[PDB]
Short mmCIF file of C-alpha atoms and ligand atoms in Angstrom, two decimals:
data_model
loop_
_atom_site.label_atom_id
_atom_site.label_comp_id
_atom_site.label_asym_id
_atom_site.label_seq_id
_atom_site.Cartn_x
_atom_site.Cartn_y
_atom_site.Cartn_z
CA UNK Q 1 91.84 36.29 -70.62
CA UNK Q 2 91.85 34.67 -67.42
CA UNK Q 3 88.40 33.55 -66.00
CA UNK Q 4 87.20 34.16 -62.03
CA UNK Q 5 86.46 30.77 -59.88
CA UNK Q 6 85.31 31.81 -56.60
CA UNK Q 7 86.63 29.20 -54.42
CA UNK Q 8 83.71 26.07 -53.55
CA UNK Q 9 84.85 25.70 -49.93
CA UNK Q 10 82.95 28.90 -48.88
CA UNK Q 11 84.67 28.57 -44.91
CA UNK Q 12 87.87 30.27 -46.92
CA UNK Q 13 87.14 33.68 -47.25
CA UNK Q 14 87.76 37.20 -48.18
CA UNK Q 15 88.35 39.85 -44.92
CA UNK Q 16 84.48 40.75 -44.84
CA UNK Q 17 83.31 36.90 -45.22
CA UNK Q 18 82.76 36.61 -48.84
CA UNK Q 19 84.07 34.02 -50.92
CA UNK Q 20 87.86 33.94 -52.14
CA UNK Q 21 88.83 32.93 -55.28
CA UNK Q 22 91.39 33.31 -58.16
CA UNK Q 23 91.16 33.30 -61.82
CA UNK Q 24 92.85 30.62 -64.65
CA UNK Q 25 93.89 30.26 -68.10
CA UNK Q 26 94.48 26.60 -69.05
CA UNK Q 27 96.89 25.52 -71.33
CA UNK Q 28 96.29 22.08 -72.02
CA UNK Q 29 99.43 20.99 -73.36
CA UNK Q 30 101.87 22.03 -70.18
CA UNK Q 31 102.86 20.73 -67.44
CA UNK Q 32 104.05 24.28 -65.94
CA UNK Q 33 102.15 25.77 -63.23
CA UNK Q 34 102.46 29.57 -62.58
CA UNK Q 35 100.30 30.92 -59.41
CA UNK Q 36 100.70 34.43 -59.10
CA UNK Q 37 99.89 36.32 -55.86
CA UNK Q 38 98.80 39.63 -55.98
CA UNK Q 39 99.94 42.72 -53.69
CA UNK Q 40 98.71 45.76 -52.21
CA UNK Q 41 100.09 46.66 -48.36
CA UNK Q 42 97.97 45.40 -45.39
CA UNK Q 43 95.70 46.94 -42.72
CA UNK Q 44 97.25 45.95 -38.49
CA UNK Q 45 94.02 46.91 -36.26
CA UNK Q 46 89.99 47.72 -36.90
CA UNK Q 47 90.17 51.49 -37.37
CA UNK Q 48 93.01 51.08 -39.95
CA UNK Q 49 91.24 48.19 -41.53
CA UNK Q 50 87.81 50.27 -41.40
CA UNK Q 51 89.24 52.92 -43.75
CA UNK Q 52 90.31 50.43 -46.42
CA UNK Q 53 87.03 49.07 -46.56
CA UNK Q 54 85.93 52.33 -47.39
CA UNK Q 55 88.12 53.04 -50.61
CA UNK Q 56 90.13 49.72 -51.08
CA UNK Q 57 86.98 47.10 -50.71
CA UNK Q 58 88.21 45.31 -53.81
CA UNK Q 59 90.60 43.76 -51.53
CA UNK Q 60 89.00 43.19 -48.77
CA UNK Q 61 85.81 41.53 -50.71
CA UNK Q 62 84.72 39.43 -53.82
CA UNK Q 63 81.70 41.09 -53.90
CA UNK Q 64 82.58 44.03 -57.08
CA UNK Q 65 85.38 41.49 -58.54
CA UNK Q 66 85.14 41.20 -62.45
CA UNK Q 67 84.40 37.96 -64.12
CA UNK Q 68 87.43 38.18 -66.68
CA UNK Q 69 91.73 39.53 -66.29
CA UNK Q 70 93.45 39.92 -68.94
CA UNK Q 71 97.37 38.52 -68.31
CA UNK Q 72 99.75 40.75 -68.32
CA UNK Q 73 103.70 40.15 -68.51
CA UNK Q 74 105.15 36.52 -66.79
CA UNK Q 75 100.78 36.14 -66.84
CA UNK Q 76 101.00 36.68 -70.99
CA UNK Q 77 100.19 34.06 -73.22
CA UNK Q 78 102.16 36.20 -76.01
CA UNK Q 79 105.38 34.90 -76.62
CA UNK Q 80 106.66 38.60 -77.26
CA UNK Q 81 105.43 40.10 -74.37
CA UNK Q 82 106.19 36.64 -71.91
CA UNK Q 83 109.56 35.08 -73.35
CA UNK Q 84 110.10 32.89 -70.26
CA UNK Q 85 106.63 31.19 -70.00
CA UNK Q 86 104.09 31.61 -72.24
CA UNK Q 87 102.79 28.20 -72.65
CA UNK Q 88 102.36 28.00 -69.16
CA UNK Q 89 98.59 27.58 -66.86
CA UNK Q 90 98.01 30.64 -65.93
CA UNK Q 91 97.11 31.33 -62.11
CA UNK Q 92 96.18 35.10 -60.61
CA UNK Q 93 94.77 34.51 -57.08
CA UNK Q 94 93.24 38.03 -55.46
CA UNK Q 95 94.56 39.64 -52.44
CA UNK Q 96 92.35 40.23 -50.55
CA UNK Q 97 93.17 39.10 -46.89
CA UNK Q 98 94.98 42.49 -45.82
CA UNK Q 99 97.40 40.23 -43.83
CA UNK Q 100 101.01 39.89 -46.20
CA UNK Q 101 99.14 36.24 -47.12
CA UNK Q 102 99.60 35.10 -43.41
CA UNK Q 103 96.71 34.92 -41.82
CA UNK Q 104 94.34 31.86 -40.37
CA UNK Q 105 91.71 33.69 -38.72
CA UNK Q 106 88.14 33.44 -39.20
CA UNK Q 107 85.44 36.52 -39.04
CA UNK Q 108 83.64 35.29 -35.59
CA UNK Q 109 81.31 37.17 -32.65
CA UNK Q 110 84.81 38.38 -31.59
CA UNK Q 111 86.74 39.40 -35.15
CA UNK Q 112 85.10 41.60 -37.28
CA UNK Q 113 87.34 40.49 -40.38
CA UNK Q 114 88.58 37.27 -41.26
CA UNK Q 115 92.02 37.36 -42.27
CA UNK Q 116 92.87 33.61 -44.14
CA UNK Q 117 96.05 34.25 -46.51
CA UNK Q 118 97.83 31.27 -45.82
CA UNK Q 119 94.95 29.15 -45.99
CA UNK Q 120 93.08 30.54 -49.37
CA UNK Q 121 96.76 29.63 -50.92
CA UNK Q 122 96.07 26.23 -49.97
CA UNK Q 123 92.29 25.63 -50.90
CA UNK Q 124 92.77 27.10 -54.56
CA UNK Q 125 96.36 24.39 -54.62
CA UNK Q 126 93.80 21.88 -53.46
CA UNK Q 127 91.38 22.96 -55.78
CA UNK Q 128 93.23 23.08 -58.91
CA UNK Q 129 94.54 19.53 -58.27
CA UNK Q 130 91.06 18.38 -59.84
CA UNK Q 131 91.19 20.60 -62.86
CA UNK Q 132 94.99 19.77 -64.39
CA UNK Q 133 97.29 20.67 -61.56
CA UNK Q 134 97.75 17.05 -60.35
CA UNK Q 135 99.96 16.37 -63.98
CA UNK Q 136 101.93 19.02 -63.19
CA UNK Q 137 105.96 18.84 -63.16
CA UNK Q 138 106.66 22.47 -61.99
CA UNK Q 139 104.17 24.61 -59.71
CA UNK Q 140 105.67 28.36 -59.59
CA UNK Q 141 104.20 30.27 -56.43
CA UNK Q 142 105.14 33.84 -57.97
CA UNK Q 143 103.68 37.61 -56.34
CA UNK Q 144 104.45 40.50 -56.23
CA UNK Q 145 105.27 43.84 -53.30
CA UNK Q 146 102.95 42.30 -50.46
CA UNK Q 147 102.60 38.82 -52.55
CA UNK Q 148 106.60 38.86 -53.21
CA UNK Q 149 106.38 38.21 -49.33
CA UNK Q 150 103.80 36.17 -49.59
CA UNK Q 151 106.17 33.71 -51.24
CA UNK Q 152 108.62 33.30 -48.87
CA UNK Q 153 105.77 32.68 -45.87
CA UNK Q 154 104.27 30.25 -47.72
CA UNK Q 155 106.18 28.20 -50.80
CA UNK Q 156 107.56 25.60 -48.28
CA UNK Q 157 103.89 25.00 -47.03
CA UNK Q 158 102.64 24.47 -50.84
CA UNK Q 159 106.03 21.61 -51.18
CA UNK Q 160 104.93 20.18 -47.90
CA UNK Q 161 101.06 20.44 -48.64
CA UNK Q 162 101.63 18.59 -52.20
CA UNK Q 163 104.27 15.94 -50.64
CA UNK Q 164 101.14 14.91 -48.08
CA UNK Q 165 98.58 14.21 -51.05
CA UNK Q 166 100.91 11.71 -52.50
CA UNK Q 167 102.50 14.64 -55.46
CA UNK Q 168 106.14 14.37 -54.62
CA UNK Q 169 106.64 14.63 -58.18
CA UNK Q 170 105.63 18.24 -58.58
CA UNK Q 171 108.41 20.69 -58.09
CA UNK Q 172 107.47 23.85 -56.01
CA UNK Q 173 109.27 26.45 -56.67
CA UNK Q 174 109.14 30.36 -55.43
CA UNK Q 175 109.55 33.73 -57.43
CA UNK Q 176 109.78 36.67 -54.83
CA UNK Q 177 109.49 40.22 -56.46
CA UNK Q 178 109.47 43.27 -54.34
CA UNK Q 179 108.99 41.73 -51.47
CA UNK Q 180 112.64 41.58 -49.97
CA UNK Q 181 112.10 44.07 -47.12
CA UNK Q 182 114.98 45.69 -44.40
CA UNK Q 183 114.16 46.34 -41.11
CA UNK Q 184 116.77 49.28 -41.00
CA UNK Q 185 116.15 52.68 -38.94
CA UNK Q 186 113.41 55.17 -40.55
CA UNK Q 187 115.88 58.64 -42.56
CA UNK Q 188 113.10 60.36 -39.82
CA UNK Q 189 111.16 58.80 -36.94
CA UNK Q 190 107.58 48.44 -40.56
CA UNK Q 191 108.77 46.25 -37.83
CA UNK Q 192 106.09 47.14 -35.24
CA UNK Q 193 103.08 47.23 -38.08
CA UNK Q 194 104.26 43.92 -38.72
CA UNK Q 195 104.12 42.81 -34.92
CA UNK Q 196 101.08 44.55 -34.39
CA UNK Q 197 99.55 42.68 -37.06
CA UNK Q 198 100.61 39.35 -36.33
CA UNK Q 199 98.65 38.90 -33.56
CA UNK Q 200 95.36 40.80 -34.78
CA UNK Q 201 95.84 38.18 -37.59
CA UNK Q 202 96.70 35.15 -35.94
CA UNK Q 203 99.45 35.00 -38.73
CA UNK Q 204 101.44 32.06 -39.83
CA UNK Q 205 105.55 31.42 -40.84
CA UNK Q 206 107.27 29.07 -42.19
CA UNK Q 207 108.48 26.09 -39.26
CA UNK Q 208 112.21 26.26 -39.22
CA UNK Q 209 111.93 30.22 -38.73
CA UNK Q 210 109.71 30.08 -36.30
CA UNK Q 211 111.63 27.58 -34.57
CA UNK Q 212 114.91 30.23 -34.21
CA UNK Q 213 113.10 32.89 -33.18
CA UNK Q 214 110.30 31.45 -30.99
CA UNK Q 215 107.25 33.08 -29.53
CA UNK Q 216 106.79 36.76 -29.74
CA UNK Q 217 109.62 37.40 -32.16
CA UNK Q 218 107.67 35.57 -35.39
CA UNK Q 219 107.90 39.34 -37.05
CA UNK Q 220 111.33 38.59 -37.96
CA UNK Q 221 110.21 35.83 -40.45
CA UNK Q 222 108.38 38.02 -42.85
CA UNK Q 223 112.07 39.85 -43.65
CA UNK Q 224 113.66 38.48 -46.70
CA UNK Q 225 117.19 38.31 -45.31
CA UNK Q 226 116.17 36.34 -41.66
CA UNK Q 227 113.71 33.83 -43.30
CA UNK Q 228 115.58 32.91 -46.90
CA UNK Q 229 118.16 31.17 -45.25
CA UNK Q 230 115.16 28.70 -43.38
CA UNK Q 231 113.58 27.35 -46.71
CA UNK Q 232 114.44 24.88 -49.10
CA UNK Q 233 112.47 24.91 -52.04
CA UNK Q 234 114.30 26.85 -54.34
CA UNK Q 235 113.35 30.81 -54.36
CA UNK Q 236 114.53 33.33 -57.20
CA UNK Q 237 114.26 36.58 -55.77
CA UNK Q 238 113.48 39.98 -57.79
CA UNK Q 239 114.12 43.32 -56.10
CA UNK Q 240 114.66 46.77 -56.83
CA UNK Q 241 117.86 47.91 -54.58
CA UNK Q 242 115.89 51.25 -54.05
CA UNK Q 243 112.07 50.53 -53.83
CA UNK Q 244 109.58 53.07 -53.56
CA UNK Q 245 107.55 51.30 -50.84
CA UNK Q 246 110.95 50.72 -48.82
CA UNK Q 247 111.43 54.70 -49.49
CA UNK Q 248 108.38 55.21 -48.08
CA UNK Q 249 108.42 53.20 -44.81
CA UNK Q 250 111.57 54.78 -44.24
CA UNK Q 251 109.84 58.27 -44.70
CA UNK Q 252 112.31 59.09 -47.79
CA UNK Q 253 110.49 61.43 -49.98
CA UNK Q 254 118.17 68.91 -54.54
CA UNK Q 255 119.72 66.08 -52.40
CA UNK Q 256 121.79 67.22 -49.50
CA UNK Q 257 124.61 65.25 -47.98
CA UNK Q 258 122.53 63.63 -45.29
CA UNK Q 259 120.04 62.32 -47.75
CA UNK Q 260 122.52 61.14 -50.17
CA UNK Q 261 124.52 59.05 -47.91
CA UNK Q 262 121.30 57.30 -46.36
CA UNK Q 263 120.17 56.38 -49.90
CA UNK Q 264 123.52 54.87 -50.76
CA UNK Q 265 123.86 53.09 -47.57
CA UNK Q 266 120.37 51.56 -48.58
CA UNK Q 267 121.45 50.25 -51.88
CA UNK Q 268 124.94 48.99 -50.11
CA UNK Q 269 122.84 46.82 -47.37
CA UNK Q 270 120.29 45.26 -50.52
CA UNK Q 271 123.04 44.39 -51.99
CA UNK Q 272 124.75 42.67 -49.61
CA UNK Q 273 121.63 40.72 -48.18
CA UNK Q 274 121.83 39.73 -51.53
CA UNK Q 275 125.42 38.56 -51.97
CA UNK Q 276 124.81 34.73 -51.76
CA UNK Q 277 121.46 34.40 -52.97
CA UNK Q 278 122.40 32.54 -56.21
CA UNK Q 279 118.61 33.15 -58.13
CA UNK Q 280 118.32 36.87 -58.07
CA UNK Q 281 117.84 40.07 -60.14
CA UNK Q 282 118.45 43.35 -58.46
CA UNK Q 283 118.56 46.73 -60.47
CA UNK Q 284 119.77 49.85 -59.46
CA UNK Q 285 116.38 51.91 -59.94
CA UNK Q 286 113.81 53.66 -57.73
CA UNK Q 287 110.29 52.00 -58.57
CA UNK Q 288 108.39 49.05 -57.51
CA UNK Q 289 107.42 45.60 -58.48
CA UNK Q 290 107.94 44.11 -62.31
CA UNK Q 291 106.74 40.53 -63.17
CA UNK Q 292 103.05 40.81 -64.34
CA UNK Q 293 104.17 44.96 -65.89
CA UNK Q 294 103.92 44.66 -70.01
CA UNK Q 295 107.17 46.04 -70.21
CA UNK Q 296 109.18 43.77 -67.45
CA UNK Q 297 111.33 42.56 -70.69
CA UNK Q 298 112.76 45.61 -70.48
CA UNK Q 299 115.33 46.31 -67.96
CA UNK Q 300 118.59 44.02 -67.81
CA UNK Q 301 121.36 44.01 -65.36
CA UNK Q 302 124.91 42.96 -66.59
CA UNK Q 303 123.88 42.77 -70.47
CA UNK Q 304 120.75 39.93 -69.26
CA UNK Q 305 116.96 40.77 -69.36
CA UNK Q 306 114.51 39.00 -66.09
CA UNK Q 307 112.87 36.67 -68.41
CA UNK Q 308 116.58 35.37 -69.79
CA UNK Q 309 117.91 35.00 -66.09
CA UNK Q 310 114.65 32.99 -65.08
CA UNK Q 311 115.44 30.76 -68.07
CA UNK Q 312 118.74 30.05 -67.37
CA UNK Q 313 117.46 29.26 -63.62
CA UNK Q 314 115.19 26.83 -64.91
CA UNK Q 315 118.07 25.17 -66.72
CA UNK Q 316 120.17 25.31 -63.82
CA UNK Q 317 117.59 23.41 -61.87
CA UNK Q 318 117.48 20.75 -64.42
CA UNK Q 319 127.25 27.26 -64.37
CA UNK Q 320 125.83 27.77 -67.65
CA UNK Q 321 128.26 29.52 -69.95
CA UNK Q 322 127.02 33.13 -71.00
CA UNK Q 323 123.46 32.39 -69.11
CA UNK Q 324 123.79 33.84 -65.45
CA UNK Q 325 121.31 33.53 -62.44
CA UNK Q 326 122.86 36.06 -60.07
CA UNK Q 327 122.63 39.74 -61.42
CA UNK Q 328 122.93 42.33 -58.74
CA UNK Q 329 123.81 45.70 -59.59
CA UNK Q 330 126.95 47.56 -58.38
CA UNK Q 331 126.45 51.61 -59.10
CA UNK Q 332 125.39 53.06 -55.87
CA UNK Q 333 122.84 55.39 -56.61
CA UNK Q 334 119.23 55.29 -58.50
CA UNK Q 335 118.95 55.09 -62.24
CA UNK Q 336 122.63 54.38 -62.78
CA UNK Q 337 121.27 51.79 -64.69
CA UNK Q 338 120.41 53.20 -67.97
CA UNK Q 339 117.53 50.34 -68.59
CA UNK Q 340 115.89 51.50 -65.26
CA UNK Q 341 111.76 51.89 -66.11
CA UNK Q 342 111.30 55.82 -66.67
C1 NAG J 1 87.26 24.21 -45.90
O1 NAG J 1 88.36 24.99 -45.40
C2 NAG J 1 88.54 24.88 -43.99
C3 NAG J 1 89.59 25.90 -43.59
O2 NAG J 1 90.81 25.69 -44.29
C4 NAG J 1 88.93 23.45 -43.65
O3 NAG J 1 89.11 23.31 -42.25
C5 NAG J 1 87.83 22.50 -44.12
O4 NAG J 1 88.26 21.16 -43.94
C6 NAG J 1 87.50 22.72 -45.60
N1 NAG J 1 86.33 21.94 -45.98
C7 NAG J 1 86.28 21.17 -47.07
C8 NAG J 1 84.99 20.44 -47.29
O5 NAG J 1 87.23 21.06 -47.84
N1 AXV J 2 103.14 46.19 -48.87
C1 AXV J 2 103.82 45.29 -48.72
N2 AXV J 2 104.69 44.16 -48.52
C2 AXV J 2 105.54 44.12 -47.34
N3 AXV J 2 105.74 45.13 -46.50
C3 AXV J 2 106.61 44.71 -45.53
C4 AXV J 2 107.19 45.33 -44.39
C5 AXV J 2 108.05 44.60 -43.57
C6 AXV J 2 108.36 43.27 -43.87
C7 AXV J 2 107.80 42.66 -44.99
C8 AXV J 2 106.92 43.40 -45.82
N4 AXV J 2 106.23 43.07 -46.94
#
């Protein structure tokens, strides 16, 4: 079990002004840090925001949050159900800023929610440093759907936060699952949720990107694709070439030939985003995230499971013969994988 620290610096808060936090599992002997950030959409204006408060408070608030997690796949002490890192310190850290972790905006006289992603991911790094994290020799920033994305906005921020202190020992490094979005037309009429939200955030990207595309045109950092390219700590990136929340942006719900041809023309563009990202796993199957799911040892692309092809990245970063990094699938249509979750 993991236990809940709600974060000391009370200024960093949850979207209704109570206290962030996230929960750890020590493991005394490592020097492997895994912090995990969790998912779960967004909300772009007050109405929208409003109605999650009503039925999705548990991430917008601390207030109802249990006191105990249990860990649950790459978060699994079990060496069965966590082959890749079970000896690890164990990090989940709640989301529950509604902003895609980018936000630096406090609740005020003139905000009625405080949206502070970017900056509760650096009070718990800053936090931790005092209870174990300043031995560390590898700090994972992992999350998943909304939290995949959080990754790439923020893992060069962690490097650069840690290099400041006087840590430029620790290597920061980024896991990125389901959050490797396209901004491709809707099958029926994300990109203006994600501007809309920006500025009723105040959110934050990563320098270099927001150097290319300047003011106004930040949305295009928080797309896998435009903002991968910009960072250089290195990122292994996990995504499902047909996932449901992509599906369902696009308004994709007996396939007919129109259909059919959009779908595979949405697995052909993942996959070649994809093509020279050399730390990636990308199965042919309709669902969505995998990393903390008990079962994520169970799909492979190629012959190679996830927690194999994050081992042989982490010996990579130390080609390995018979121990592969890049796995992207080739059949063009959902499921043609037969190790696809069912
Ligand atoms: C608390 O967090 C805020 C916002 O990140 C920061 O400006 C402030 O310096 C922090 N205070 C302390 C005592 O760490
Ligand atoms: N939910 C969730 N995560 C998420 N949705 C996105 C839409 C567009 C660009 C990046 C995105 N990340």
């Amino acid at each position: 079990d993991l236990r809940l620290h709600l974060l000391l610096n009370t200024s960093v808060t949850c979207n209704d002004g109570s206290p962030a936090g996230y929960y750890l599992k020590e493991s005394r002997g490592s020097r492997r840090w895994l912090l995990f950030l969790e998912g779960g959409w967004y909300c772009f204006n007050r109405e929208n925001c409003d109605s999650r408060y009503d039925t999705m408070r548990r991430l917008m608030s601390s207030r109802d949050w249990p006191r105990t997690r249990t860990g649950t796949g790459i978060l699994s002490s079990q060496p069965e159900e966590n082959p890749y890192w079970w000896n690890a310190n164990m990090v989940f850290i709640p989301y529950c800023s509604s902003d895609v972790w980018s936000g630096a905006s406090s609740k005020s006289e003139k905000n009625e929610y405080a949206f502070m992603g970017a900056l509760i991911i650096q009070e718990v790094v800053r936090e931790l440093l005092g209870r174990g994290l300043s031995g560390a020799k590898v700090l994972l920033l992992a999350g998943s759907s909304a939290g995949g994305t959080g990754v790439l906005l923020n893992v060069d921020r962690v490097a650069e936060q840690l290099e400041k202190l006087g840590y430029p020992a620790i290597q920061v490094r980024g896991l990125a699952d389901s959050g490797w979005f396209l901004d491709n037309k809707q099958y029926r009429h994300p990109t203006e949720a994600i501007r809309r939200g920006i500025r009723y955030w105040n959110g934050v990207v990563p320098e270099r990107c927001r150097r290319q595309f300047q003011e106004g045109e930040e949305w295009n950092c928080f797309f896998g694709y435009k903002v991968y390219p910009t960072l250089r700590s290195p990122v292994f990136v996990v995504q499902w070439l047909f996932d449901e929340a992509q599906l369902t942006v696009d308004n994709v719900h007996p396939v007919q030939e129109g259909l059919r041809l959009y779908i595979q023309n949405l697995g052909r563009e993942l996959r070649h985003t994809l093509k020279d990202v050399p730390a990636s796993f990308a199965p042919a199957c309709l669902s969505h995230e995998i990393i903390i799911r008990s079962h994520w040892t169970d799909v492979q692309v190629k012959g190679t499971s996830l927690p194999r092809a994050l081992h042989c990245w982490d010996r990579s970063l130390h080609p390995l013969k018979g121990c592969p990094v890049h796995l992207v699938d080739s059949c063009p249509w959902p499921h043609c994988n037969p190790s696809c979750p069912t």
